[PDB]
Symmetry: D2
Subunit: 30 residues, 4 copies
C-alpha cells in the first residue's frame, strides 16, 4: 500500500546500498 | 574501478532511499 | 584515514537506518 | 509518534550516511 510500498522500496534500495558499500570497502582492502 | 565506482552507485541508491522515505513521511502525514 | 574509515561509519549509519526502517514497517503493520 | 519517529530517525541516520559517503568519496579524490 501507499507508505507500505514506499518503505518496501526504501528497504530494497537501502540494501542495494549496503551491498555497493561492502563492494567498495573490499575493493579498498585490495 | 571497483572502490571508486561502488561509491558513486551507493550514493545514488541512498538517494532514492532518501526520497522514498520522504514520500513515506508524507503519505504517513496523510 | 579518511576514505577507509568514512566507509566503515557509513555502513553502520546505514545499519541503524535499515533497523529503524524495519521497526517502522512493523509499527506500520500494527 | 511510533512509526513517525522511526522514520524521522531513519531520515536523520540516512543523511549522516550520505554525509560519511561524500567524505570517503572526496578522500578518494585525494
Amino acid at each position: 500500500a501507499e507508505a507500505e510500498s514506499a518503505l518496501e522500496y526504501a528497504q530494497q534500495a537501502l540494501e542495494k546500498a549496503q551491498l555497493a558499500l561492502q563492494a567498495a570497502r573490499q575493493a579498498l582492502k585490495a
